[PDB]
Design a protein around this ligand. Sequence first.
Ligand code: ITN
Ligand code: ITN
Ligand code: CL
Ligand code: CL
Lengths: 207, 207
Amino acid sequence: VRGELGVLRVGFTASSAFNSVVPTAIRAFRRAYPDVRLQLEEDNTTRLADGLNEGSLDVAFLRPGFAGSERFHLRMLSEEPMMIVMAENHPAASYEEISLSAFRDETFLLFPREIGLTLYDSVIESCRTAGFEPTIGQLAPQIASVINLVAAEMGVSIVPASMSQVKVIGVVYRHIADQTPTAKLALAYRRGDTSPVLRNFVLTVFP
Amino acid sequence: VRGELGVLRVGFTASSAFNSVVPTAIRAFRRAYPDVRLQLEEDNTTRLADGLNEGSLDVAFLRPGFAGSERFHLRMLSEEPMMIVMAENHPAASYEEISLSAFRDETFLLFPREIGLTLYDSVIESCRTAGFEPTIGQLAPQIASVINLVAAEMGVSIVPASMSQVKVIGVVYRHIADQTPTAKLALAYRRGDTSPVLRNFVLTVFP
Ligand SMILES: C=C(CC(=O)O)C(=O)O
Ligand SMILES: C=C(CC(=O)O)C(=O)O
Ligand SMILES: [Cl-]
Ligand SMILES: [Cl-]
């Protein structure tokens, strides 16, 4: 009955909390191991990987593919389509089918690349696969902040599909008919960290 | 034509971005002063006030009432009701009218008090006015994170009404029939900071 006491420091990105796997895993662990204290931290993949490396986090829900990710265990938990988010009165909002080529001259809002290089680069790659280099306008700190600026008609963005729960008045979400990479979420933890609390958490997320 | 170039560091809390005043003000300023670079930071009132004090922020959308707030200019921008957020299958979800006394023995999820003492204390005060001391369960980093854990049926919370745009599957928002303090948002900036860029921003938010 090891690993039933202690504190586990658990990190996740702000957008990842909107993917059901994150609350589902947290709730499942709290039920199975009620005496373990979950200290939750919300931060982007760059910071979460740094926290794992320095020992200030024990496990993270982050986006895979960052430089040096092979130094950790990463287990895929969710892959989801990306969607376009735009103002409700954007001309493309009444299109039967959305193609990214419609936005070749449109301003894209994004978050700063340095906080999450893989997801940022996947938005860029999506536009490149559609044949253009996106014009990037105002940067906002998180995807939820980006969406709120989309409501103010400052541009469009590309977001994990689960962000379509964020029904800010004046925005719409549309599926992309073009081929686009998924947004990816993995559970991440240190190699050779044999803590029984961490093991109990990992085996709760992957029964 | 002073203050039409430079960088303005503008802070706001994660939940405040969901109040229309924040995107409305940002868009209005970007239109009126296109050459000024808006560097946006999303952080809680404690950090935003510290940033103003140390000069790493020039202006913030924050919640008024913090210790030492008299050292800054605060101009009220929005007051909004607070609402209860709960799982869709919570027994109170099918009540005609919601009273906080229904939750006297219910677990409340919250964010850590230290990041935003006034809003946290106003949730506590709401329950006290309804006649009870709330039992606080799992803490999550931001209000949006709290809402996602409410979807996993880990408790209920009390949120600014504009967070009802965050339609996480499995949660519902209800108005509170009890008297509760508003959630409050003010524009905050340093006293005796005579920068023309900051002045142009303040006068855009308050035309
Ligand atoms: C902005 C991001 C990118 C990241 O942190 O990897 C997110 O919310 O997941
Ligand atoms: C959690 C808070 C409280 C604060 O930062 O004042 C918010 O999102 O506004
Ligand atoms: Cl492996
Ligand atoms: Cl004053």
